[PDB]
Design goal:
The protein is of the alpha/beta class. The chain has helices at about 10-25, 70-85, 90-95, 110-115, 170-180, 210-230, 240, 250-255, 280-300; strands at about 30-35, 40-45, 55-60, 100-105, 185-195, 195-200, 235-240, 260-265. It has one domain (about 1-304): Zn peptidases (Aminopeptidase, 3-Layer(aba) Sandwich), CATH 3.40.630.10. The chain is built from 9 helices and 8 strands. The longest helix is centred in the C-terminal third of the chain and has 20 residues, at about 280-300. The chain binds the ligand CC(C)[C@H](NC(=O)OCc1ccccc1)P(=O)(O)O[C@H](C(=O)O)c1cccc(NC(=N)N)c1 and zinc ion.
Length: about 300
Amino acid sequence: GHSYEKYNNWETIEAWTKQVTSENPDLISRTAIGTTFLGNNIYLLKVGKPGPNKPAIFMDCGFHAREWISHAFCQWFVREAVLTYGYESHMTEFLNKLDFYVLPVLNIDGYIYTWTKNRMWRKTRSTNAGTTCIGTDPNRNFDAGWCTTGASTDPCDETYCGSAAESEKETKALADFIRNNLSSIKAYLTIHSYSQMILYPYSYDYKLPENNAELNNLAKAAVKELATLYGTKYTYGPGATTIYPAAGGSDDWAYDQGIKYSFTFELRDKGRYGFILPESQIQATCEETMLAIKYVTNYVLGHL
Ligand SMILES: CC(C)[C@H](NC(=O)OCc1ccccc1)P(=O)(O)O[C@H](C(=O)O)c1cccc(NC(=N)N)c1
Ligand SMILES: [Zn+2]
């Protein structure tokens, strides 16, 4: 069964998307935006009070299979939204005024693989011509300085950029959806672990985004907000210099589509447990992360 303080396998997460939608008909709608290489449905949840011409924030989790706390966060977020709507003033305002598109798990095939075969799997599970090596790094697969730096052209490597940009059904589906909704999507938030950072563009080059001063101030405010709960310290900055240069990432691509608020979140911890973050830390991790996501949401709402 589904728990919010445990990591849930895909069958359970899928059942949950159907259940939470059924239980909250005027706050949540479910669609699928594509299928994975292995035929799983890429569900997207539209969270918000329906209305005409509403702006939106897009958030995805589970780009990378082994980053389990990411998947956990998208599920936590959805419950918080439906539990507190009508009671907590900010979330009530958020859901009245905008829609959150929440994509609980992008890389479903890899996630399943981390449950069944290899806890440390990262990439998708697509096949590659001329080799037995499996998978492409979805966050090297977007059309953003594609495969020029911090990526591999070898399918056997963890950062394989794929045979071409959007070669993966999963990344094509995500790009297609975002391209189809550019008029409404005002921010892009992509949830990863670990490192306790908020990154903004660019990672594929050392050039800075036009609005980098604003993004820096926004990230700064968001991390200090996060720290209020448990003292957790996040660093922040443009990807290339803050963590490492790397091309083909979705945050850079979304920004260059015109989504001016584009962030990669790296959640707990800083390496003690790394990707294998204890379930005992899910609640506290999600709780503090909510504060940063809500700060960003309120700021974006104030700049429409
Ligand atoms: C621990 C955490 C930072 C993860 N990093 C990771 O597994 O690094 C492994 C690795 C191994 C060899 C070469 C490069 C990278 P990840 O979540 O995969 O980091 C993102 C990524 O590399 O896709 C990441 C972190 C910060 C910013 C961005 N943005 C971007 N467009 N590159 C992307
Ligand atoms: Zn990641």
